[PDB]
């Protein structure tokens with residue numbers, strides 16, 4: 040198994056990067072000694088007026104409807120060209 | 122609004138028949154708020170070539186052309202299988218994009234004009250419209266286009282709005298969507314079809330001589346009519362284009378009137394009679410054959426022999442991907458067959474067809490038809506085609522031009 | 535073949551030459567004969583006519599009839615409407 044595991048792939052580290060990206064993306068900036076200082080602000084903001092309306096804005100996006108059709112038509116053209 | 126000084130001081134219109142100065146010109150915009158507007162001018166069926174020329178290249182700010190192509194087909198009776206339609210639009214995109222072409226049609230939202238405009242919108246989304254906008258110029262009758270109430274105005278209407286109706290289309294027709302220019306024509310009548318033909322052919326000849334005095338030699342830009350299938354009007358516009366010597370009509374090998382000429386074009390001119398064409402009209406126009414007058418049959422059966430009289434302007438092709446045959450092959454063959462039998466002795470048969478055969482990847486036709494063994498060449502003639510083949514990554518034309526007489530010592534001198 | 539040669543020369547003008555022979559040519563795997571003899575280039579088609587043969591070819595795992603009926607005029611937007 041060890042030889043099969045070590046000789047399996049070179050893309051393991053690249054896959055790991057993505058595992059790091061999510062949790063260290065979402066977490067607030069200030070370190071865990073002072074994380075309660077961020078919790079006070081983010082907890083006070085949470086119940087008064089809705090904060091961070093896009094929870095994830097660099098991963099998941101909702102395209103405008105006028106753009107969507109022009110976007111899909113381009114990749115259908117590229118599919119036939121492929 | 123600087124064009125408005127000229128466009129109410131040169132171009133007239135027709136009424137009552139007497140003529141008067143025109144109105145109702147501007148820029149139409151369709152339903153999408155941001156879909157790019159066009160430019161419409163009515164010109165009532167009889168105008169000077171100089172005034173139309175000044176409208177064409179000066180007051181619309183429109184650059185010189187490289188290849189004019191014209192598409193004629195059936196409207197309101199046009200049926201084609203999905204396979205042939207798909208192959209035709211895929212070929213027509215590549216024809217219309219590799220060269221800086223102009224494409225011309227009778228733009229109304231009915232049939233073959235719809236199938237041209239949808240391929241043009243598919244490419245302009247596929248291109249992203251960065252620069253070099255494709256010009257798809259349309260010519261339609263003023264009288265038979267409908268719901269012009271929001272369009273007729275005596276002072277100009279630049280953000281002119283227009284909506285597609287698609288309901289009241291019994292004796293009138295709806296205007297198309299995917300064009301950019303519009304020349305509407307008016308004969309003083311409000312119901313008759315088929316007025317546009319004469320100014321369409323005269324506009325083809327007018328565009329054909331635009332590239333003269335611009336460069337070193339007097340070579341005119343090529344024109345090509347591509348006919349798919351259509352009824353009594355399409356045969357009329359084919360004949361009216363072929364009266365002019367330069368246009369070359371290229372026919373699809375699948376349709377109804379295209380199958381008529383595809384079956385007539387085998388026999389000699391003496392063989393064809395009025396019984397044979399009557400037999401073929403019963404055979405191909407299965408429905409609506411009855412509605413035809415015998416006198417109208419007598420008119421077609423003279424039109425068809427006048428089309429068959431000149432055999433070096435008539436070419437039937439058949440699209441098949443197995444035998445490596447497409448629309449560009451047909452355009453290039455029908456363009457080479459015309460020039461070889463002409464008044465000129467030489468030096469113009471090859472000059473503008475070589476760069477067009479290099480821009481497309483059609484090496485096989487090029488070698489036999491242009492590099493005939495009875496020809497003689499010099500490297501200083503073949504330098505620009507060598508540069509054009511070498512930049513755009515076509516190694517086979519490099520291999521062929523290298524051994525037909527391009528010296529590298531002369532080329533990089 | 536002997537069933538298609540009879541019906542084409544008959545008293546009726548049309549609309550019965552193909553209706554019961556198409557489903558029988560789809561139940562058997564005989565695509566090659568079907569295309570030339572029934573899908574003549576001088577014919578015209580509509581997807582609402584070819585829906586039941588499309589269903590019968592699609593259930594019984596015949597991909598070639600799917601490929602042929604798809605390009606002779608069956609629209610998927612009309613079929614799964």
Ligand SMILES: Nc1ncnc2c1ncn2[C@@H]1O[C@H](COP(=O)(O)OP(=O)(O)OC[C@H]2O[C@@H](O)[C@H](O)[C@@H]2O)[C@@H](O)[C@H]1O
Nearest residue numbers: 193194195196197198227229231294314351352353354355
């Ligand atoms: N320019 C037109 N636009 C829309 N509909 C038309 C047009 N011309 C004719 N029609 C309608 O279509 C019917 C005939 O259709 P076809 O015979 O298939 O087309 P055809 O008459 O040959 O006209 C072909 C059209 O294309 C252009 O090349 C040319 O400007 C001509 O008008 C007629 O009943 C007529 O009402």
